[PDB]
Every structure is written in C-alpha cells, then in structure tokens.
Amino acid sequence: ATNRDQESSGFAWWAGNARLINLSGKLLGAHVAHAGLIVFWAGAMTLFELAHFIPEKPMYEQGLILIPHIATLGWGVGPGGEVVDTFPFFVVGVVHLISSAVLGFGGVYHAIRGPETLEEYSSFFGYDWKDKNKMTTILGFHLIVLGIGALLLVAKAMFFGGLYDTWAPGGGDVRVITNPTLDPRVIFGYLLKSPFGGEGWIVSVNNLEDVVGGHIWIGLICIAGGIWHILTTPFGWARRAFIWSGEAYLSYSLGALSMMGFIATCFVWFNNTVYPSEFYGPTGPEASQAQAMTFLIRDQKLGANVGSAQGPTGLGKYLMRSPTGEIIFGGETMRFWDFRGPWLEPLRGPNGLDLNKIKNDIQPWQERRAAEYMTHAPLGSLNSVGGVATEINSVNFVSPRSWLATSHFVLAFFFLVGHLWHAGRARAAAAGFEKGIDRESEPVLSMPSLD
Amino acid sequence: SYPIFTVRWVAVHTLAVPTIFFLGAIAAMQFIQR
Amino acid sequence: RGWFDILDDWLKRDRFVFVGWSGILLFPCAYLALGGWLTGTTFVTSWYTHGLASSYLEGCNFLTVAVSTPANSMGHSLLLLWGPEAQGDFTRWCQLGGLWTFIALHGAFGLIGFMLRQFEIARLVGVRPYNAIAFSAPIAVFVSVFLIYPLGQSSWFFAPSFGVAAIFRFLLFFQGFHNWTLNPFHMMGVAGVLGGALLCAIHGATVENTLFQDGEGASTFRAFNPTQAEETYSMVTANRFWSQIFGIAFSNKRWLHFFMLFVPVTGLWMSAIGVVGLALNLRSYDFISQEIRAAEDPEFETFYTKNLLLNEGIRAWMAPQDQPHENFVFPEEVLPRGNAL
Amino acid sequence: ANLWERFCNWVTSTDNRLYVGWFGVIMIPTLLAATICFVIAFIAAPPVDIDGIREPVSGSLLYGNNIITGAVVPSSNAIGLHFYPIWEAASLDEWLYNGGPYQLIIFHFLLGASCYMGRQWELSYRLGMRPWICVAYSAPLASAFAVFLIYPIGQGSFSDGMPLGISGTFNFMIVFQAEHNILMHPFHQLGVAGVFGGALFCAMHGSLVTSSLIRETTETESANYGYKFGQEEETYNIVAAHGYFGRLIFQYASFNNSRSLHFFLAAWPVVGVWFAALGISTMAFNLNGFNFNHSVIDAKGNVINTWADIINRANLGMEVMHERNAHNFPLDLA
Amino acid sequence: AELTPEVLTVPLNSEGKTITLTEKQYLEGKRLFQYACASCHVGGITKTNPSLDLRTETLALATPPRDNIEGLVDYMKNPTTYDGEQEIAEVHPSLRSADIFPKMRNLTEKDLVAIAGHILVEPKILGDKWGGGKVYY
Amino acid sequence: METITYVFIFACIIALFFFAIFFREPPRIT
Amino acid sequence: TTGERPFSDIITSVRYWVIHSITIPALFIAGWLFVSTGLAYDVFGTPRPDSYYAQEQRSIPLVTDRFEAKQQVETFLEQLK
Ligand code: CLA
Ligand code: CLA
Ligand code: CLA
Ligand code: CLA
Ligand code: CLA
Ligand code: CLA
Ligand SMILES: CCCCCCCCCCCCCCCC(=O)OC[C@H](COP(=O)(O)OC[C@@H](O)CO)OC(=O)CCCCCCCCCCCCCCC
Ligand SMILES: CC1=C(/C=C/C(C)=C/C=C/C(C)=C/C=C/C=C(C)/C=C/C=C(C)/C=C/C2=C(C)CCCC2(C)C)C(C)(C)CCC1
Ligand SMILES: CC1=C(/C=C/C(C)=C/C=C/C(C)=C/C=C/C=C(C)/C=C/C=C(C)/C=C/C2=C(C)CCCC2(C)C)C(C)(C)CCC1
Ligand SMILES: CC1=C(/C=C/C(C)=C/C=C/C(C)=C/C=C/C=C(C)/C=C/C=C(C)/C=C/C2=C(C)CCCC2(C)C)C(C)(C)CCC1
Ligand code: OEX
Ligand SMILES: [Cl-]
Ligand SMILES: [Cl-]
Ligand SMILES: [Fe+2]
C-alpha cells in the first residue's frame, strides 16, 4: 500500500485523508464518492419526505425541508402553495438517488481501482497544487459549471414553468418571470445595502424579478470569470498575497463556505420570498406581527377603537409609531416593524399601517392567515414540542426555518473553525514550522528581549 | 499461564453483571403501556 | 511480618486496580453510592416523598430520573433501613426516600475513601500529595451542598436530589429563593471554574503550539518519548508569545502548574462557604440602599430590581408543587404576573 | 526602504513590547473605543429605555448602581436590529436614552476581539510557532458573538443581547431559561461538562505536575525557584506522575504522552465551550431545550409530575414576571 | 386510576342520552384533536381567543349548547359565535370550510364524534388543567 | 463616596496592569 | 503490566465467547423478566400506571408523619383498592 500507514505518509489514521494531498487519482475518487453522498441524501430524503407527506397538511407542519425547495421552484404546487401534484417531488428524489449510484461508482473506482495519481496518465487531469496556472484553469472550469447552474434557475423561471411567487397579486401562485431586473443599480444595490435592521443586505430581496435578474448577472459573471481564469495566470500581487498549496486552497473555500452558511441562516430566518411562508412556515418576525394582527382583529370585532387604545406603558396597545414615524403594530412586535408579507401589505398605506384600511378592509383570508401564522411561530423544543419552552406536550412542531437556520449556523461556525485551522496550518506548512520549533535554530532565541 | 479470577475479574463483574441486567430491564420497560 | 504486615502486603500489590487500605473504605462505599443511584433511577419512585415520577420504570428518561430526597416530614433522619421509619422493610425504605440518604452517606464515606487512596498511592509511589489536597475542593462542595445545606434547612428534602433535572431544579430554587447569583462567594466560584477552564484550554493550546520538532511526522504525538529528560515544548517561545499578545506570561513552569491547582480549587472552596451561609438562609439577597430607593422612587429601576421580580415569580409559581408538604394553595389571583402573560 | 516599507516593518515587528500586526491595526482602535465608551457609560450614562416601553433602566454608578447592579444597558426594543450610531441620533441625549452606547461598545468589541483572534495567529506565524492558539480562543470568542450578536439577530432586537453588567448578565440568564429551557438543552449540558471538566482537568494537571516536581530546593525556599526560565530539562517527573495517576484509576486511563495530555487539556474545554456557544446561537432561532412537560401520564390520563414539570413551574414564574409591562398579547413570540 | 367506562361516558344530546366511548375512540379522538385542533386548542384553551375555552361548563353556556357530542359535532360542521348569532366557518375550521381549512377535508362523522368525545372526556381526566392555561401546568 | 470608591479601586487595578506589563521583573534566560 | 491477562486477548478468544454468548443474554433476559413479570414494582414499591391515584383521587399520597410513615404508605396503598 502506497501512503496508507503513518510511517510512510507522516499522518496518523485520524488525519488520514491528509495522506491524499498529493495523490490526485485517489483524491479525485474521494471527492466523487462524497459528491455521491450529497446526491444520495438529496434523493433519499426527498423520497422519505414524500412517503411521509400529507397533502392536506401544510409542508411546515410535516418536518419537510426538501419538498419546500422543490415547491418554491414551481413544481407540484398551485395557488396559495397547495400541492396539485406529488409526481415532481418523486422525480426529483428518484433522479438524484439513481445518479448517486453513478457518482458512487466513479468515486469508488477512482479511490480504490484507478491510478493513485493522475499526472502520469494525463496532463489535463493531472495537477500540481503549486502550478498556479493549472489551479486557475480548474477554477475556471468550475466557475463555468456554476454559472450555467445559475442560468438553469433563470431558465426554470422564464422558459420552463416559472417559480412560486408568494407576492403574486391575488394570492401566491407559480408565475412565469418575463421581465427580470437587469438594471445593475438594483442588482448590485443589494450588495451595498446595510446588513442591519430595515435594510438587511441581500436577505431583503423581496421580488422574483430581482431574484431572476440577479441569477442572470451571477451566471454571466461566473462564466466571464471562468473564461478569465482559464486564459490567465495569477498576477504578481496575488502571487505575493496567497499561500499556494492544497491545504491553503481548502482553507479559502472553508472561509467562503462558512460565510455562505451564515448568510443562508439569515436568508431562511428573515426572507419570505425565496423561502415562502406557505412552504416553510412564517418567519419569526411574521408570526409576531400576525399575533398583533390577530388580537387587533378580535378586539376591534368586539368594538374597540384600536387606533386610540393605550397600552399599560402609554404606547398604543395595538398601533404605535416606529422611530421614523411609520404606523406599526404595538407591543413587543415593535422590533419587527420591518416585516413585509403578502397578508399584511394590503393594510399598509404611505405612512405605514392605515387605520381606515384596518377598520374596513381586513378580509377573512388575512384573519385566517394571521391566526395560522401566530400559532405556527418558529418556536419549539428539541423533541419538537411546539411553542414556548413552558408549553405542555401536545403539538408536534418545530418550524423548518428553525431547523434550517440552526443547522446552518452550526455548520457555518465549525466551517469557520476549519478555515482558521487549515489557514493557520497552511501558513505554517509553507513557512516550514508546522511540525514544531527547530531546537537548533529556535526563532525567539535570536530575538532581543522585550525587557 | 495467566490466572482467570483476579481482583480485576471481580471489579469487572461487579459492574458488568448488574449493567447487563439493568439494560435488559430498561429494554423491557420500553414496551410497557399505561 | 505478622498478620497485619501480610495483609498490608496483599492490599498494596501492584495489580490492575490498586486496593490499599483505603480501598476497604472506598470500594464498597463508592459502589453502593453508584449502584444505589443506578438502582433508584431505574426502579424507584418519588411518589410518596415528592409526588413525582423519577425512574425509568415509570417512564422518565435519563434527564428526568432522580433518586429524590426524603419527605420533609422525615426531617434530618438518617433513614437507616433498620431505623424506626422503615423498620427493616426494604420496599417501604425505598418509598420513604431511604435510598437518598443511602447514596449521600455512602457517597460521603466513598469520597473520604478516594482522598485516602490519593494519599496512600502518593505515599507509596513517592510523590507529593497535591492531588489529595486539590480533591478537598470537590469534598468541600459535596459536604456543603448535600450535607450542610439541608442540615441547616428543615429536612433532607431541600438537598439536591441525585438526578439531572432534579439538579436543575436545585439551581432554579437557589435563584428564586436565595438569589444565589448575587452572592460573592458563588461569584468567586464561577471565576474559579471558568478561570480553571480558561487555564485548561490556554495551557493545553500553548504547549501544543510551542512544541519542538522532535520527529518527522506531521502528527506530532509520536515525537514525545515518556523517558526524555528534555522539555517537549519551548517555554521561552510560549513566554514571548503571551508577553506580546496579552502583556503578561508565565516564566516559571512550577508556578504555572501550581496556579492551575490553585484557581479551581480556591473557587470551589469559596462556593462551599456561600452555600454554608445559605444553609441558614444567610443570603446575599438584597442591596438595602437600592431597596430603600426603589420603594420611595417608582421610576428607579436596575437589573437588580428586575431580577427580584423574576425571583418572586419563581417562588410563587414553583412552591406549591416543589414543596407539597406545605400544602400551598395559591389562588390564581394571588399569583404575580406581568401584563398579558 | 520607503516609508510604507518602514511602516510595515514596524507594524509586524517582533521586537515591539506588545505585538501590533495587521489585525492589531484594527484591534487597537476598536478595543480602545469600546473600552473608553464602556468605562464612561458604566460610570455616568443616564437610564436607558431598553424594552422600548418608555421605562428606562438605570445602569450607571452615578445613577444609583453599584459594581454588581451596574450595566451598560442594551439598546431600545424600538430600535430592534437597526444600526444606531451617534450620527443617527438627533442629539447625544436621544442616543443615550435609546441605549446608543451598547451598540457602539459591542460592535467595536466584537470587531476587536475577532482581530484579537487573528493577532494570535499572526504572532505565532511571526514567532515560528504552530498556529492553533487562536482556535482555542475561538471558543470564548464564539460565545461572545452568541450572546451579543447571534442571539439579538434571531430574536430581532439588540434589546435582547446580554447587558454589559453583572446583574444584567444574571437577568439575561434567567430570562433565557424561561424562554428556551437552556438547562434542558444538551449543548448547554455539553458546555457545563466543558467548564466543569476544564476546571477538573486544570486542577488535575496542576496537582499532578506539582506532585511530581523534582527536588531542587531546600525547605526554607519556594519550590518554584527549582525551575529556571529557559532550562532544557523538564522540571517534573512525568513517569512518576503517570505512575501515580495510572494507579489512582488504572494504568490505561492515564496519559504517558505529554503531547497527548496537553492536547486533551486544550480539546476538552474548547469543544465544550464551542457547544455552549452553539447552544445559545441555535436557541437564538428558538430550537429550545428538551420539553418533557406532561410526558408521564398514568393509566387514566392523570399527569404524573416529574422533575421536568418542577423546572417548568420555575420557568413559568420567570416567564410571567419578566419585562412585566412589555407584553400586550398572550404569547411571547420573540 | 383507569380510563373506565364511567370516565368514557359523555352526553350525546341535549335531552340526556349518553354515549360510552371506547378507549380506541378516545385515543383516536386525542390523535385527531392534536392533528386538527391543538394548534389553537392545546390543553383546552384557545390561543387566538383566550376568552372562550373548551371547558365543559363553558360549552354548556354556549348557544346552542356544545356540552354534548351532537352539539360539538354540529359545531365542527357549522361553527358559530358563543351566542350562535354569527356563522364563523370562514375563520374557524369546519366541514363546511374544508376548502380553506384543508385538515378538515377527510374527517368522518366517526372522526367528528371521536374529537367531540376527547373534548368531553379530557376535563373529567385532567380537572381544572383542561381550559386552565399555564396556571395549572 | 460609593461611586468614588468603585472608580478608585478600578483605577488602581488599571494602574496595576500598567506596572505588571511595563515594569515586570524581566524574564531572563539562564 | 501487572500480571493479569490482557483484555484484547480475552475478548478475542473463543472460550470467552462460548461462556459469554450464554451469560450475557441470560442476564439481559433476567432483567427483562424482572420488569415483564412485574416483580420490580413489588420489590421497590413503584406504582404501576394504574396505581398512582384512586379512581376519583386528585391528591398525591404525601408522607406527613416521620414515625408513622410506613403506616401512611400502607394506608395509601389500601386506599387504591
Ligand atoms: C466521505 C468520506 C470519505 C471518503 C470518500 C474517503 C476516501 C478515502 N480515504 Mg478516508 N477517511 C474517512 C472518510 C473518507 N475517506 C474517515 C471518516 C476516516 C477516519 C476513520 C478516514 C481515514 C482514512 C485513512 C487512515 C486513510 C484513508 C484513505 C482514503 C482513500 C483510499 C481508501 C482505501 O484505501 O480503501 C481501502 C478499503 C477498502 C477497499 C474497503 C471498502 C471501501 C469501499 C470504498 C467501500 C465502498 C462501499 C460502497 C457502499 C460501495 C458502493 C458501490 C456502488 C456505487 C457500485 C480514499 C480516497 C487512505 C489513503 O489516504 O490512502 C493513501 C488512508 O490511508 N481514509
Ligand atoms: C441541513 C441539515 C438538516 C436539517 C435542517 C434537517 C432537519 C430535519 N430533519 Mg433531517 N436529515 C439530515 C439533515 C438535516 N435534517 C441528515 C444528514 C439525515 C441522515 C441521518 C437526515 C435524516 C432524517 C430522517 C430519517 C428524519 C429527518 C427529520 C428532520 C426534521 C426533524 C429533525 C429532528 O427531530 O432532529 C432530531 C435532533 C437531533 C438528531 C440532534 C441533532 C444535533 C446534531 C447532530 C449536532 C451536530 C453538531 C456537529 C456537526 C457534530 C459535532 C462535530 C464537532 C465536534 C465539530 C427536520 C426538518 C425527521 C422528519 O421529520 O422527516 C419528515 C425524520 O424522520 N431527517
Ligand atoms: C469530477 C468528476 C470526474 C473527473 C475529473 C474524472 C476524470 C477522469 N476519469 Mg472518471 N469517473 C467519474 C468522475 C470523474 N472522472 C464518474 C462520475 C464515473 C462513473 C461513470 C467515472 C468512471 C470512470 C472510469 C471507469 C474511468 C474514468 C477515467 C477518468 C480519466 C479519463 C476520462 C476522460 O478523459 O474521458 C473523456 C470525457 C468525455 C468523453 C466526456 C465525459 C462524459 C460525461 C458523461 C459528461 C458529464 C458532464 C456533466 C456536466 C455531468 C452531469 C452530472 C453533473 C450534474 C454532476 C479522468 C482522470 C478513466 C481512468 O481511470 O483513466 C486511468 C477510466 O477508465 N472515470
Ligand atoms: C469562486 C470564485 C473565484 C475565485 C476563487 C477566484 C480567485 C481569484 N481571482 Mg477571480 N474572478 C471571479 C471568481 C473567482 N476568482 C469571477 C466570477 C470574476 C469575474 C467577475 C473574477 C475576475 C477576476 C479578475 C479581474 C482578477 C481575478 C483574480 C483572482 C485571484 C486573486 C483574487 C484576490 O486576491 O481576491 C481577494 C480580493 C482582494 C485582495 C481585493 C479587496 C477585496 C475587499 C477587501 C473585500 C470586500 C468584500 C467584503 C467581504 C464585502 C462583500 C460585500 C460587498 C459587495 C459590500 C484569485 C486566484 C485576480 C488575478 O489574479 O487575475 C488573474 C484578478 O486580477 N478574478
Ligand atoms: C470541506 C471541508 C473539509 C475538508 C476537505 C477537510 C480535510 C481535512 N482536514 Mg479539516 N476540518 C474541517 C473541514 C474540512 N477538512 C472543519 C469544518 C473543521 C472544524 C471541525 C476541520 C478541523 C480539522 C482538524 C482539527 C484537522 C483537520 C484535518 C484534515 C485533513 C485530514 C482529515 C481526516 O482524515 O479526518 C478523518 C475523519 C475523522 C477522524 C472523523 C471526524 C469526526 C468528527 C469530528 C465528528 C463528526 C460527527 C458527525 C457530524 C455527527 C455524528 C455522527 C456519528 C454518531 C456517526 C484533511 C486534509 C487534520 C489535519 O489538519 O491534517 C493536515 C486535522 O488534524 N480538519
Ligand atoms: C467500608 C464499608 C462500609 C461503610 C463505611 C458503610 C457505612 C454505612 N452504611 Mg453501608 N453497606 C456496606 C458497606 C459500608 N457501609 C456493604 C458492603 C453493604 C452490603 C451488605 C452495606 C449495606 C447497607 C445498607 C442496607 C445500609 C447501610 C447503611 C450504612 C450507614 C449506617 C451504618 C451503621 O450505622 O452501622 C453501624 C455499625 C457499626 C458502626 C459497626 C461498629 C463496629 C464496632 C467498632 C465494633 C463493635 C460492634 C459490636 C461488637 C456489635 C455487637 C452487637 C451487640 C451489642 C448487640 C453507614 C454510612 C445504612 C444507610 O445507608 O442509611 C440510609 C443502611 O440502611 N449499608
Ligand atoms: C494508551 C494511552 C492512551 C492515553 C490514555 C488516556 C485517556 C484514557 C481514556 C480513559 C480510559 C479509556 C479506556 C482505555 C482504552 C485502552 O487504551 O485500552 C487498553 C487497555 C488495556 O488493554 P489490554 O488489557 O489488551 O492490554 C494489557 C497490556 O498488558 C497489553 O499486553 O484496555 C483497558 O484497560 C480496558 C478497560 C476495561 C476497564 C476495566 C475497569 C475495571 C473497573 C476499574 C475501576 C476501578 C478504578 C477506580 C478507582 C477508584
Ligand atoms: C472511498 C472510501 C469511502 C467512501 C465510500 C463512498 C462515500 C462511496 C459512495 C457510495 C455511493 C454514493 C453509493 C450510492 C449507491 C446508490 C444506489 C445503490 C442507489 C440505488 C437506487 C435504487 C435502486 C432505487 C430504487 C427505488 C426506486 C427506483 C423507486 C423508489 C423506490 C426505490 C427507492 C427503492 C469510505 C468512507 C467508506 C472509506 C474508505 C474509502
Ligand atoms: C443572485 C442574486 C442576487 C445577486 C447577487 C450578486 C450580484 C452577488 C455578487 C456578489 C459578489 C460580487 C461577491 C463578492 C465577494 C467578495 C469577497 C468575499 C472578497 C473577499 C476577499 C478576501 C477574502 C481577501 C482577503 C485578503 C485580505 C483582506 C487582505 C490581503 C490578503 C487577502 C487577499 C488574503 C440578488 C442579491 C440581486 C438577488 C437575489 C439573487
Ligand atoms: C442500593 C442497594 C444495594 C446495592 C445495589 C447495587 C450495588 C446495585 C448495582 C447496580 C448497577 C451497577 C447497575 C448498573 C446499571 C447500568 C446501566 C443502567 C447502564 C446503562 C448504560 C448506557 C445506557 C450507556 C450509555 C452511554 C453512555 C453512558 C456514554 C457513551 C454513550 C452510551 C450511549 C453508550 C444493596 C442491595 C447492597 C443494599 C440495598 C440498597
Ligand atoms: O425583550 Mn428582552 O425578553 Ca426576548 O421574549 Mn419577548 O422579548 Mn422580551 O419578551 Mn420574553
Ligand atoms: Cl426582566
Ligand atoms: Cl406584545
Ligand atoms: Fe503542563
């Protein structure tokens, strides 16, 4: 066995995948077999989700996370997000599950049967980690693949059925996007938006014309930079900036993935556009806004004048002003006055929540939505007891938004730790002291004392 | 060549014998209904 | 070489588990404490002492099982199996919480056996007995919490019950009734525990990151040999790193390792003293000058007055079930509540 | 050498008494800004309407507080997650009423403490050390992000972040238990095992090394003088310490490798505190501790209480009393 | 204590004929109540309107009386306000609004009886806990 | 007097930090 | 190194497993039967799911007298029939 023990490889069993750093044939097989694990799970989970799925229950009541991802794409859903057909979920699960036997085969093949190194067999599929031009070429190859993937979403939205649109007028529906936002002041304007409250950076994207036109821009940028990296070598400022080794490139992707996981955690928590509340449940802000709506509606039905009702503190019990003066829901939900959702936006005038609209124009579908969202707030226990920590056992609910945000916080945190681990190790390995201090030339011993 | 019953044998069985008894008891408890 | 010296020979044989003279006390007392806990949490109820289910046999999980304390009407009774409460009936003894005092007393004498074992082995191998001295802190904590605390209170009922959620209740009881977070002896304990965990993390990372390259492997554990005279890591490099990062750094390895003894041991001893005060309800409950000001100025609010409102909530909401010997009927209108909730 | 080369040589200089470095050019002004504003606001800030309900909480020493009760109070619930610098306020008086200092302190501190982590990598790189001290510091740094930033983001308001004060810390803890049952969350339990274990292993490693110190001194002197700074021989007998501890428990429960020992000393508290940080950070999105309220039911259907139901009774009392004027509707949803 | 026939015997109508439910019927009713009703009615309260609970004495003072099986079954078909004055199917789940409350679509009369039996048996089991809220947890 | 006391002790601690860092007994390799 | 036989040598030998493929399942089945026959309730006095309360009892049978506590439990148990 070449490199499959600690004496020959330098790495113990518990760091045994580091024995593959300079074995590109087996290292390719590790990646292809692991790609098959991802695709296996995407297929197996979907079939599990579909086999447990009740179409007359909402998706968010059923512990589903992958069916809502398919439904948001426009597949299998009708107006308001009701499931009109379970066959697209069955196709997406089956095709992933079959394809993972394919990726599993070539992963197993390259990792046990194929050549341990690809360099002798092929100059095109071989690489040195230190060959900067080969590194940018493969980077360019994968950038093109990702840009085409972003245009696949555009093609779904424009030419192959559309996407589910929670903001579609007259209630949410699958809608073909015809005029995506191509204006770069809007698309790149989200990049300069503050991440703080009321702004929210890219998480604030609130319409599918911005989502589709952004993916047009991303798909063309990734194809352009793909072609750019195939046809260039890193400039001297980048050569003197970075560490050029496999562990270093891993660490850059680790920091990149950690940053993206934190972003997705905030996406699923706050955004009800690309994570529609009919599929994922109400957001945290949404349900708190929906409780204030529920008790405004009930008490105003009893005869209360909700605009003039003073709470215990002297703020309005139902309605109050935000610090810039917009009319907002009172109580603790004053913090969530930046929430925007299709059940609430009909009540909102130019200066905020309109008292005349609130008195007259609250439809029964809004009252049903407010009560349903208030009672499906993303709060629950680890054993999936719905509601506050003091609630009794009965309701079996943890919102998908809570599952998706918490999982991706954990993953993004540990990926930041992995970034720090591998980036520090790659620097020490390139500078040559990752195995410790040379006793015969210890650096501090030739530095002057601090005092 | 080695002995079979030592102090170590007793120390092991004072833990392991009741442990396997308790695990069988706790397994049976998973099938009780109210 | 009489019978005593022959017995002393056998007790101190180099075997897999050392026995020693201390093992006569340690081994049966520790095994009965552990075995009593596993027995009670698997099979024994708390229905007659607390009105609680507390075993796996009743339906509880690992987080909710406990060997619960005896009923408050037991007082500080030793609850011996042959004592006047059980009168020899094992089944009644279990139902009266006799397992709690069984575990607490065998556990106490077992801990005494463990420190004697630390002293005995240290004397036989020829090392200094600092491990026995550091173990006085867990002994001070067990004695103050499980013995001195209920002895100052009405009965053994108010000691911690041996169980995970039962211990969590004990934490919440000490907040709501004793305001134990406000106590400077607890605060000194927190600093000792979190300081010791800091010292554990910082010393282990520093050694592992100032290691000398003593081998060619990238996995560096093999480059230590247990018989080497030389240091495996650079004290000089470690000292320069921390002097520049943090301003101060250890320069004496012996003082460093003493300070690692001192910090969590002193912290736990400090926390034990505060619990001894809470045995008599000698709490650091209030700040009088803030209470005088808050009572006359209804706009004066601090986080301290906010915490006391939480404490009052804890007491009125938990006391009827947590203290079912008091027969508390608090009608719903007497319950302190905020608006809406 | 031009001025930029002379400047870069100074910044990354290993001969400075405290290492500056590139992370330090961010760490130094942000931490100074956070410290100065903290000391001023702790001494002299006016009361702060933390809950957005025109009910200002006095945090400073000059306004009644002592060291224990004092706090820099988290910013107003009316602000939420909105960025509130000084220049957003119409006056300094308004900024102080709404809890402006808190946002300034925590943002500067978290930026500076992140750069403290990078500075720990940076110096170890300059000194030729191995780089993973900063990974160990990521455990308390993540905890600080958890209570000051991640928990406010999930709950929608910096009013819910941990206050910068001793009693405010306890207020944060009690309310968190009321709403999340953190004691019943296994990530906090792993966190407790981290710090209890860390304190145990600190005392254990300290005592075992002190127990096995080689005799170099007389009775009339401190034993610490038996060690000289920079000496090459080890100052204790690790074989004697392993011989003790391997007989206290059993031989294979004791480390005979000091590198494996010291890695275990790093790994146990750090992983546990990492899990404690992920406890807070995932309870930020309301995935709470285990709920066994009314889990045990008799044959008729009577609830048989457990210790978990007793915890719930305490949690209810904290719940109904916290922020006693702030709730208008029957569910505390954030 | 056991879930005897006397516990499982609830009023069927307003006159006074009783029905003794089976343990299978009560346990199916609890499952369907959790499935369709406990998101607002957990423990016998009403989360979106705490003034009106599911206590037996409260359902008795409803117009028409809902403190029997057929009264609860008619409410699950055609729910009203507490005085019976308005029909609230457009905001309350029922058989007649199963198109907007889709968990009500495949409910049988046997299912509606079982849910109605669970609402009547449960306060005989739990006492003041049912409809009491957090005070009695 | 209370506020003066607490600030005084705090200022003495910060002064102690200054002397402990900049006027420490210098660690000497021997 | 203290003279006893190594654990790796024992648990990998056939004679260990000839002995233990009987003793280990026998102890497990004995523990199972301790619960399934109901003996664990009788030995420990733990209430069965139908013997916490009398049929219309809402009150917990709390022991209130130290020296008559054995008699109170017995009285509480006679109240269940
Ligand atoms: C995603 C998980 C993953 C993947 C894809 C790999 C992949 C690899 N590891 Mg790594 N490793 C992992 C996790 C993983 N590892 C973990 C968790 C550990 C710690 C236990 C290690 C510790 C480790 C060490 C110590 C070593 C490796 C080595 C290797 C390489 C060769 C393995 C070998 O010699 O097989 C030999 C084993 C077999 C042939 C037995 C069966 C294995 C096959 C592949 C099972 C396939 C089953 C699957 C169901 C078949 C489906 C077929 C179908 C699709 C048609 C290979 C690329 C070796 C290496 O680096 O070589 C230089 C090496 O020395 N790994
Ligand atoms: C993005 C990842 C992700 C998310 C958000 C979810 C979310 C969900 N899953 Mg899914 N699932 C996943 C991955 C995920 N899963 C994986 C990897 C598997 C294969 C095992 C599954 C297989 C699966 C099944 C079979 C089922 C679910 C179900 C569910 C639902 C209920 C979950 C529950 O009760 O957990 C229980 C909670 C735990 C098990 C505790 C998790 C704590 C983790 C392990 C901590 C990890 C930290 C760290 C990474 C590990 C330490 C490393 C560190 C030292 C560095 C929820 C929607 C259920 C459902 O409702 O289906 C409809 C269900 O039946 N999942
Ligand atoms: C990252 C993935 C990847 C990469 C870089 C390689 C690279 C290689 N493979 Mg491997 N292999 C893979 C995955 C991969 N393979 C998979 C998934 C399987 C299972 C089918 C195999 C099974 C396999 C065998 C049996 C053999 C190789 C061989 C080779 C070598 C020559 C192949 C060639 O030039 O054909 C020329 C390429 C073409 C004519 C076009 C490729 C055709 C595919 C279908 C296009 C797919 C592209 C599309 C985007 C992917 C769709 C799924 C996507 C969404 C993920 C080269 C090193 C040979 C070898 O080992 O040499 C010693 C060899 O004998 N591969
Ligand atoms: C996965 C995607 C990917 C990766 C790994 C790379 C990697 C690389 N690119 Mg390439 N590039 C890409 C996609 C990618 N590129 C795409 C899609 C395009 C088309 C837009 C390009 C166009 C491009 C050009 C024109 C150049 C590169 C260059 C490089 C090399 C050095 C870059 C560098 O120093 O960054 C680090 C960035 C800096 C040092 C600049 C300062 C950045 C600030 C401080 C960060 C601000 C971000 C912050 C987090 C805020 C984010 C939100 C914000 C919008 C508000 C490196 C090999 C350079 C090169 O070597 O060419 C051959 C180069 O000149 N790339
Ligand atoms: C894409 C992500 C990625 C990749 C490709 C690598 C790759 C590598 N890592 Mg890195 N690492 C990563 C992310 C990654 N890492 C992250 C996120 C962290 C933070 C936790 C680390 C922290 C880390 C450390 C501390 C070390 C490495 C090391 C390595 C090298 C050897 C790995 C090995 O053989 O482990 C074999 C696999 C195992 C021993 C099993 C790991 C099990 C984990 C800890 C628990 C998983 C629990 C699971 C999620 C849930 C429970 C399920 C269970 C009950 C079945 C290899 C180059 C080693 C190295 O530096 O070599 C140069 C090394 O010492 N990594
Ligand atoms: C070193 C071992 C050790 C120690 C220190 C203890 C200690 C204790 N046990 Mg435990 N126990 C042990 C081993 C031990 N036990 C073993 C191996 C078993 C299994 C058989 C038990 C089973 C057990 C049960 C069931 C109970 C205890 C109890 C106790 C407590 C009270 C004992 C008592 O008062 O007797 C007093 C006896 C002596 C002090 C011996 C005196 C010796 C003197 C010096 C000589 C004179 C004796 C004299 C000649 C006798 C003549 C009688 C004549 C006058 C009539 C005490 C903490 C009780 C308890 O836990 O309370 C809740 C209890 O109920 N033990
Ligand atoms: C090997 C060094 C690794 C560093 C060790 C440090 C971390 C150790 C982790 C904890 C122990 C983990 C298990 C070791 C894993 C390991 O390394 O195994 C190795 C070890 C010995 O293996 P063998 O017996 O095959 O080897 C004997 C040698 O002579 C080989 O010839 O196995 C055990 O000791 C089995 C444990 C059974 C335990 C029986 C205990 C009986 C009760 C004793 C309790 C009384 C003492 C209490 C006193 C109050
Ligand atoms: C290298 C390596 C490794 C790894 C491995 C891997 C990772 C692999 C992968 C693998 C894979 C990744 C595989 C896959 C496979 C799959 C398959 C085999 C599939 C199947 C399918 C089917 C057949 C289906 C069916 C169906 C249908 C069609 C319908 C519905 C129903 C059902 C589902 C039944 C380890 C770690 C061990 C270590 C050593 C080395
Ligand atoms: C799709 C979409 C969209 C769009 C988006 C876009 C347009 C994006 C872009 C983005 C981008 C365009 C990104 C960027 C990024 C960047 C980064 C992230 C950077 C970083 C850097 C770094 C990391 C560096 C580092 C360093 C330093 C700092 C110093 C020196 C050295 C070094 C180099 C190391 C929207 C929202 C509309 C909507 C929805 C959908
Ligand atoms: C009290 C008493 C006594 C004693 C008894 C004893 C001593 C017992 C023992 C018992 C025992 C001695 C038992 C055992 C048990 C065991 C168990 C129950 C186990 C379980 C296990 C498991 C469940 C596992 C788990 C885990 C862990 C822990 C960690 C890692 C992971 C796992 C998952 C594997 C006498 C008669 C003298 C007298 C009277 C009273
Ligand atoms: O702020 Mn501070 O503590 Ca968080 O839950 Mn909602 O809001 Mn208020 O109540 Mn509970
Ligand atoms: Cl509060
Ligand atoms: Cl509210
Ligand atoms: Fe050490």
Residue numbers in the entry:
A (entry chain C): 23 to 473
B (entry chain F): 12 to 45
C (entry chain D): 12 to 352
D (entry chain A): 11 to 344
E (entry chain V): 1 to 137
F (entry chain T): 1 to 30
G (entry chain E): 4 to 84
Sentences from the paper on this structure:
Water molecules are split into electrons, hydrogen atoms and oxygen molecules at the catalytic center of PSII, namely, the oxygen-evolving complex (OEC), through four electron and proton removing steps as described by the Si-state cycle (with i = 0–4, where i indicates the number of oxidative equivalents accumulated).
The overall architecture of the low-dose PSII is very similar to that of the high-dose PSII, with a RMSD of 0.21 Å for 5310 Cα atoms between the structures of high-dose and low-dose. The ADP for the OEC atoms (12.8 Å2) were lower than that observed in the overall protein atoms of the cryo-EM structure (22.4 Å2), and the occupancy value of the OEC atoms refined with Refmac5 was returned to 1.0. Nevertheless, when the atomic model was refined under the same conditions for the high-dose and low-dose maps, the occupancy of the OEC for the low-dose map apparently increased. The Mn–Mn distances in the OEC refined under these restraints were 2.9 Å, 3.2 Å, 5.1 Å, 2.9 Å, 5.4 Å, and 3.0 Å for Mn1–Mn2, Mn1–Mn3, Mn1–Mn4, Mn2–Mn3, Mn2–Mn4, and Mn3–Mn4, respectively. Most of these distances are shorter than those of the high-dose structure and close to those of the XFEL structure, although most of them are still longer than the SR and XFEL structures by 0.1 Å and 0.1-0.2 Å, respectively. After refinement, most of the Mn–Mn and Mn–O distances of the low-dose structure are similar to those observed in the XFEL structure.
